[model samples]
Every structure is written in C-alpha cells, then in structure tokens.
Target: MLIVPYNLPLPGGVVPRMLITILGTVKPNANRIALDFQRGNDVAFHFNPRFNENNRRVIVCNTLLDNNWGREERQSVFPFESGKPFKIQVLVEPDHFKVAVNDAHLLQYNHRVKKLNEISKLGISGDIDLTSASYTMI
Candidate 1:
C-alpha cells in the first residue's frame, strides 16, 4: 500500500490525533511485513512484524531519520497469522501513537520526527496478500 497526500481525505496531509485504519490479509507463510509513514526523506515510523525470525515472532518499531535507523524496539505480542484477515488501527496522539491489531491494543511509539502533519505518504510491503487497503483515516 502506498498513499500520497492528495489521495487522502485531507487537503494537504494528515494531522495529529487522526486515526489510520488498515484492513488486509497476510500472505501464506509470510516471513514479515513492514509499514511506513513517510515525510520527504524522513520515515516517521517503521512498523515491522516478523513471523519467522529465527522461528519466533516479534514486532519491530523504529524511525528513520537522516539516513540512520533509530534503535529498534522488538518484542512479541503479535495477533497476526498467515492467510488470515486483520484490522490494524493507528491513532496519532499528542505524545505517542497507539496501535491496535484485530481489536487488541498492540504497541506505541513516541513522537520522534515531530510535525505530525508533515507525514504525507504511507507504504506497506513485504509478505502480504494485501486484499484491500483504503488504509483510510477517520
């Protein structure tokens, strides 16, 4: 999934407190999936889930700034499985962003890049079937 600012409901870009929703299915035997929110050359958030990282499960959270990836937050609380549909919602709050997967709260990442409204693009890739993604916000 890829979204430009013009494709969004907003005239310019997203704002703080906006909720982003993602609905799709993971590919069969998927190794991992990555979702990113981008602004210019900066990646405000990098969300990655590893299904078979050394035969284990974990999700990674990080930020890409000035071509360097910040320390990654890796842990296991995944609610995803291959070939199953999922709903992921991300809420951008004032201090940190909250994420929920399949109606369960998953994780949070504090504001790093700042200027939330500057984030104008969304990217989703890796081992995913990606059935449908407006990945829209309310």
Candidate 2:
C-alpha cells in the first residue's frame, strides 16, 4: 500500500503452520528497511536490510523485549540489491520460523516470542516501495 511504517493485522492469529511474505523494491538511497512481527509492545521478529552502509550489504534478524533487542543474527548471503525488488518468505513451524529470500533458504529463527499467536501484527518501514505483504494462515 506504499504506507510507511505500515501495519496490518493478520487474517488470524499466527499458528504453527503459516506463511508470511514481504515483497518490495529497494530504494536507491536506501539505508535500511525494517519489518517487524509485533505482539503489542514486544517484537517477535525484526528483519532489517541495510544497504547504504559503506557498500557492504547485510540482513539482520532479532527480537525485542522490554525495549531491548535480543541477540541479532546477521546473514552474509546479501540476496537483495538496491534498485531491485525482492521477496522474503517466512514459513512458521512448530518451533521456528524458516525464512527464505527470493526462494533461497536463508535461515531459521527459533521461537523467541514463544507463543506464535501473539505475533499477530506486521509493521514495515524504511527505504522501500512495497509491492505487497501478507500473513497467510496455513
């Protein structure tokens, strides 16, 4: 919807088997894009794409609790490119979220929030032109 810091309610509260897809174009002047799965004040998952950091590329993943971030996971695959579009797919399993970038398996994030259903909101912001995003219950 081209909404900055866009927030959407999931069709249903997240379950063990579900899929989340975030797709968008990377702005040329992009420094980063943050995608968050939120449960009220807690962030179940944080996905960040950093581009304008001295030419180095990275995707950061983490969780937030009580206003503090938990351990962050950085992936070096660098699948996204500035000025291009990409798809980030997340498959929710019983114990973890398996993420893929453009169909390539990226990484699995263990259930930090513990209760999947609580992560019923999606918030997105940063240097991106969103094409579409959704939380599909499966």
lDDT of each: 0.77, 0.84
| Candidate 2 structure lDDT | 0.84
Candidate that would win on TM-score: 2
Model 2 agreement with the true structure over 1-138: per-residue lDDT tens digits: 577778878754578768889889988868898888888889998888787556788888999999999999988777888789889888989888888989999888888898777788889999889988876667
Q: Write the per-residue lDDT of candidate 1 for residues 1-138, one digit (tens) a residue.
A: 443211233234456667887777787898888878787777788889999888998999999998899999876888999999898888877888789999999999988877777887777777766654444445
- Model 1: ten consecutive residues of lowest lDDT: 2-11
Report the Cα lDDT for candidate 1: 0.77
Q: Whose lDDT is greatest here?
A: 2
* Model 2 pairs in collision: none
- List candidate 2 stretches off by more than 4 Å: none
Candidate 1 residue spans exceeding 4 A from truth: 1-11, 135-138
